[PDB]
Paper text:
CRISPR-Cas is a set of microbial adaptive immune systems characterized by the insertion of short viral- or plasmid-derived DNA fragments called spacers into the CRISPR regions in the microbe’s chromosome. However, the type II-A CRISPR-Cas systems of Streptococcus thermophilus and Streptococcus pyogenes encode four Cas proteins: Cas9; Cas1; Cas2; and Csn2, all of which are essential for adaptation in vivo (Heler et al., 2015, Wei et al., 2015). We show that the Cas9, Cas1, Cas2, and Csn2 proteins of a Streptococcus thermophilus type II-A CRISPR-Cas system form a complex and provide cryoelectron microscopy (cryo-EM) structures of three different assemblies. The structures we present here shed light on the initial stages of spacer capture and reveal an unprecedented higher order assembly of Cas1-Cas2-Csn2 proteins that appears to play a role in this process.
In addition to the monomer complexes, a fraction of the Cas1-Cas2-Csn2 particles formed larger complexes: one formed discrete particles that were larger than the monomer complexes and the other was filamentous. A structure for the larger discrete particles was obtained at 7.2-Å resolution. These particles contain two sets of the Cas18-Cas24-Csn28 minimal complex bridged by a pair of Cas14-Cas22 subcomplexes, with the protein components again related by D2 symmetry. One form contains two of the monomer particles with an additional interface comprising a further four Cas1 dimers and two Cas2 dimers. This “dimer” complex (Cas124-Cas212-Csn216) contains two fragments of duplex DNA running through the center, and the additional pair of Cas2 dimers caps the ends of this DNA. In the dimeric state, the additional Cas1 dimers dock at a site at the hinge between the Csn2 head and tail domains that is very different to the sites bound by the Cas1 subunits in the monomer. The same region of both Cas1 N-terminal domains (NTDs) in the dimer is located at the binding site but with a different site on Csn2. The alternate binding mode in the dimeric form does not induce any significant conformational changes within the monomer complexes, which, at this resolution, are unchanged relative to the free monomer. Duplex DNA is bound along a central channel but with two sections of DNA, each of ∼30 bp, bound within the two monomers. The larger Cas1-Cas2-Csn2 “dimer” assembly shows that additional Cas1-Cas2 subcomplexes can dock between a pair of the Cas18-Cas24-Csn28 complexes and are able to access the ends of the centrally bound DNA via the Cas2 dimers. Despite the medium resolution of the dimeric Cas1-Cas2-Csn2 structure, it is clear that the conformation of the middle Cas2 dimers in our structure is more similar to that in SpCas2 (Ka et al., 2018) but differs to that in other Cas2 structures and in the Cas1-Cas2 integration complexes.
Numbering used by the authors:
A (entry chain D), G (entry chain H): 1 to 219
B (entry chain P), E (entry chain O): 3 to 289
C (entry chain Q), D (entry chain T): 6 to 90, 100 to 110
F (entry chain C): 1 to 218
H (entry chain E): 74 to 146
Write the structure that this text describes.
């Protein structure tokens, strides 16, 4: 997952988490505007190993952390499917749940037989039980750090998003929290690209000087 | 190259696909190297790559680096411009003092004659007649110093008796600026010829790297003196711009009307060929 | 609304040339000015006069004639660059 | 930036016609589409590509050739309307 | 200054608070301006700033640029306050023929002695004894041509009687490759000394522009022919890979075991200082 | 208007443009959390000149400038209602609009009667004409400097919002652009408060030290 | 790009080049059979960061290096497009080629006008010139190392292949050649997985003991 | 068959003039040198054969005019 712009000499590769610091406010604002307008502008080009350019629908752009909606129909559906798989991996728990919903089905069936009208039904499944429970992620009481962590957790659930990009999101988190975010990103394998005006101390990042020189920086 | 590119703005320069790449935050522009003759950096905020410097050395393009005051600081000199340089060094060591003093005397005669032509175009009969008398009185070894007297009477007649070459005024500053630019172009031409620039054709005691290029650039000084005389009332910035207009303007060579760079290149070629052939023909440049 | 209008048609036949002269005279009578050959423009007061002018232009278009119409702002009209068919000193920086 | 381009030139001489064909082929190779004769347009990505295109068009302009360049918005470029064609005596028949 | 700063890696250079900032991907180093003496750029990926170039003009430090081949191409020439190397070139123009013949004869004697010693290490006593006899028979002006006679014996001993330098083969191309690398190193050292490489120690042939460095690198030539003899069966690519390890390998100088760069540097410095001082001591290198 | 939290000794007043710098990352992130949770959490308070607490509906919190849509259902509703009020203030113009709408309805009604299929219609209204025309604020923004200006225009247009708050939005704009934004805020009289992790040089701002003490700057 | 089988405790990630050494011949042959039959068998599961299982059409399996055909219609077509892009990046060369093609078209057009029949044509393009030249990769005289290198070069040209896998291909290459293959794979960013019965000395690899224990090995 | 006889006819007409065919061979040699240089610049090995006049005619698409307004034409 390499990104390239006219200011760079060679296309830079983005693997796992990547912290890109732009020391020039003009090039930073122009790059962010090229991130929002990316479908319209040909200056910023992001391509994969196949050299194929990714569509703006495949690109995931995030600026406001707490304003973004983490709960979507696809995210909640795939999450319910993941929970159903977790319950399916354990035979004993699945057997017990089958017994409980089974007994409930017996009761409701008796109540239906007591009625004068002829009533038919099918089944009460686990996905219907989860949908009836209303399982969803809670962003209401979550701190910004837990919000970005939940975004990194649900990025695997998003199928269409090729790369996640954060705009000036590293100013809220402490150095240790940034270390946790990067260390978790290395395990999640997702491609995250952070854009900050000022460099963060203690983490590996790519620095773009006002001279338009891109250099790797350990601190 | 036909084109003099001057960069006074902060930006980054790269070399891509035989093309000079000017990259800035506001805009980016690509200029081919074959069209570019001279590259001038007028500010200290410009960035460049050593690969572009190597491509400029292979393209034989003069690179000039100025100071924060915009005055030229240091220019790039390639070690080997052509393979004929190593063979020309033996000829330069084999040169004779009679050929050096003869060619230098003829060049000084061309410079004084050009000054008399400038004063004649300026309609000064006594001054151009006196400078012409010094031209007819020029001799080998220069015992009478008629060249320095011609310069003193030239500047003292043009700018007034109270004027002097040792003054710090913007007139002498623009004169040294034009002499530095023409000295840079002539020095680059001498680098193209391959002969040693530090060896002069007049005084073997004076040791300077610009001596030879100055001796070759002596006849062209009045061209700078004209624009300096016309723009002397204007500010030093406008005088510098008018000095930059000399590269765009064309001058009439004895053969035909040519650009300044072509006249300097062909003139230096005829001078080197005349030095190696021991004065076969002396190129003469007139205003 | 600045109305830019391009006009063309095969001119070979005499009837086609006469129709071209008639259409050009009609464009001049309607307030359009010819910047160059086939290039014209007119300043329409509002969208109403623009629509009526579009209908009139469709009615007055000669046989085989072709008209291109574009809506342009004053800032875009002042930016119009007409080139009718090599610099020694190139300056990148302040132009002095 | 939507670039509207008009192109005209005297076509009488054979060299002029050859130059017109060469310039038209150059316009087609650069991405310009001909809506009608002398009428062309091309979508430029930004202002830099527009300036470079202006310089290239000035360099490729044939002798006596005349080019009119106008900037129009993409939405205004879609607003382009192409019309392709009061008499007392109407004659349907031989025109006498 | 004293320390000679050379940049062989990709990096950027800046100037802040009278401090040169060198930035590489691994680490950042800041060097005081007064400590630096000569600055050389080995590769084409180095990035520099014109402000640092102006500070170097005020500091008089010599700036050397190199191409992808590592051969020095251009150097920075200031208009005023020139470096002392330009004053040192005049002594190179003043080099006497007796000193040049003495240093050349000593170099040929060192190369032939290294060839005979290498043949002794290869356990050929007749060929090494013959080359040693030619070494003891070498004389000034080279009437015997014992070097060209020792050549055929050395190559015929190494690669066989059928092998020759004129034939086109991966062995000859490998020898020209190793001689190209050694010519790049010795040429870079001569450029560091400031002496013009066009002036050679051999008075017969001025054709090559590298003649000085090509004459200085002769005593180290057999070290390449050893690896070329061991790897002769391998393809030219593998021979290039083996010859690329000579920079990492350490060799025994007369004083102490050192890297090839420092050995060539000390040898070149002793050669230049001996030529300017007219033969105080001749650096001797033995395998 | 004034804002008050447990960290400050006394509530600080926010008038026209205001720049607030928080030198503690924990207090900054917790402060933004208190901004988004302001309805849920009672820690952060805002007291106007009337010394009355304001609901979160009256507080306008904008973090991403480019990601904030200028066109919304409520904004278009208030704009269409405003244009309808302006057209209702002039009886003659609205009468002419009713006449033209009557003519168009007569033409379309005649064409409907010409058809063989029965057609039923109701009427055409000025609101349906505005919504049919698609009246909306200009969506063209070249840079974030212009987008923030449009946000200030729509904020000054909205009467219900008593305060506009930007979180780390000053890092995109240059110092000169910050001066133009402050001058435009002083000319528009609107109340704008900025939250930055680090201090900005050259402009007047309130610096909150890690010691929790608040000090004025420039 | 993580691969997982029943023998592994956790799914192992494959990034750039990866050397997997199976010390047990039974598990190695069974794993290779599961690689050829992968669509039929559910034991071996390869999934990306999205956890989506890749189809066998997306998987590229290679055993015989010299027997594989590197020249295909899609590979040659995309290669010709790449050459056309390389010629398009240089304005001067494209201008010269356009001039020559213009001359040839003038000659052929004159010959067409000389004929009695009315003849029409269109153009001679650069892609048609390359197709007429017959540009293709030469595997005839290529050594096995150059063949695998050309396969790593054309893997970027293949759009549908998600991951390239080699079966016992490291036995022919010398240690230095393996170092060149890995170092080139790090630059190409492609995902390559090698399967060898015996461990290779000097390169980082994952070793599977006869005890079925997977351990990282530096040498 | 019609395009085969037409292309063969044009090839015969070009073969009747040695100088014109020589110039065509020179231009084809230049284009082959340029494309060959671009192929050598690429990192992947490339093998080519040659370019022929028949492949140039077929690449140009020489054919009889397909424009017919009416059945009379
Ligand atoms: Ca159900
Ligand atoms: Ca519920
Ligand atoms: Ca062929
Ligand atoms: Ca074709």
């Amino acid at each position: 997952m390499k990104i390239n712009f006219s200011l760079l000499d060679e296309p830079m590769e983005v693997n796992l988490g990547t912290v890109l610091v732009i020391e020039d406010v003009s090039v930073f604002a122009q790059l962010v505007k090229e991130f929002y307008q990316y479908d319209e502008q040909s200056n910023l080009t992001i391509f994969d190993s196949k050299i194929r350019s990714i569509r703006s629908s495949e690109l995931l752009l995030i600026t406001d952390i707490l304003g973004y909606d983490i709960n979507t129909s696809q995210v909640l559906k795939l999450l319910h499917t993941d929970i159903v798989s977790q319950l399916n991996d354990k035979p004993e728990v699945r057997s017990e749940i089958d017994s409980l919903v089974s007994l409930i089905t017996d009761i409701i069936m008796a109540e239906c037989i007591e009625n004068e009208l002829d009533i038919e039904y099918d089944e009460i499944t686990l996905l219907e039980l989860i949908k009836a429970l209303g399982v969803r992620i809670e962003t209401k009481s979550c701190t910004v750090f837990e919000k970005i962590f939940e975004i990194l957790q649900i990025f695997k659930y998003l199928v269409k998003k090729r790369i996640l990009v954060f705009v000036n999101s590293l100013s809220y988190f402490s150095k240790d929290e940034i270390y946790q975010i990067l260390e978790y990103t290395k395990l999640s394998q997702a491609d995250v690209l952070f854009l900050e005006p000022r460099q963060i101390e203690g983490i590996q990042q790519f620095i773009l000087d006002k001279d338009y020189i891109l250099m790797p920086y350990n601190n | 190259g036909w084109r003099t590119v001057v960069v006074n703005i902060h930006s980054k320069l790269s070399y891509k696909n035989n093309h000079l790449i000017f990259r800035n935050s506001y805009k980016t522009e690509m200029i081919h190297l074959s069209e570019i003759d001279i590259l001038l950096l007028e500010t200290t905020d410009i960035v460049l790559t050593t690969m572009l410097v190597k491509r400029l050395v292979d393209e034989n393009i003069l690179v000039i680096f100025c100071d924060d005051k915009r005055l030229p600081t240091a220019f790039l000199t390639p070690y080997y411009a052509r393979h004929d340089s190593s063979l020309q060094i033996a000829r330069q060591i084999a040169w004779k003092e009679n050929v050096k003093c003869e060619v230098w005397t003829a060049i000084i005669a061309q410079k004084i004659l050009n000054q008399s032509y400038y004063l004649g175009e300026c309609s000064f009969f006594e001054k151009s007649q006196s400078i012409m008398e010094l031209y007819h009185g020029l001799e080998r070894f220069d015992p009478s110093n008629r060249e320095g007297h011609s310069a003193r009477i030239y500047f003292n007649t043009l700018f007034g008796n109270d004027f002097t070459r040792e003054s710090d005024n913007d007139i002498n500053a623009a004169l040294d600026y034009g002499y530095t630019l023409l000295l840079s172009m002539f020095a680059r031409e001498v680098v193209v010829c391959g002969c040693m620039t530090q060896i002069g054709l007049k005084h073997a005691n004076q040791f300077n790297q610009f001596n030879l290029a100055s001796d070759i650039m002596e006849p062209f000084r009045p061209i700078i003196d004209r624009i300096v005389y016309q723009n002397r009332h204007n500010n030093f910035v406008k005088i510098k711009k008018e000095l930059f207009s000399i590269f765009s303007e064309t001058y009439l060579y004895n053969g035909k009307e040519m650009y300044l760079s072509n006249i300097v290149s062909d003139y230096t070629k005829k001078v080197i060929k005349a030095l190696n052939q021991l004065g076969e023909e002396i190129p003469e440049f007139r205003i | 609304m600045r109305m830019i209008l391009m006009f063309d048609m095969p001119t070979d036949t005499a009837e086609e040339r006469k129709a071209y002269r008639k259409f050009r005279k009609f464009l001049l009578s309607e307030g359009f000015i010819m910047h160059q050959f086939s290039v014209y423009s007119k300043l329409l007061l509002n969208h109403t006069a623009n629509t009526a002018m579009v209908g009139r232009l469709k009615a007055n278009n000669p046989k085989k004639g072709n008209i291109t119409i574009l809506t342009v702002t004053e800032k875009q009209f002042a930016r119009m660059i007409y080139l009718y068919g090599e610099e020694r000193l190139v300056f990148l920086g302040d132009n002095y």
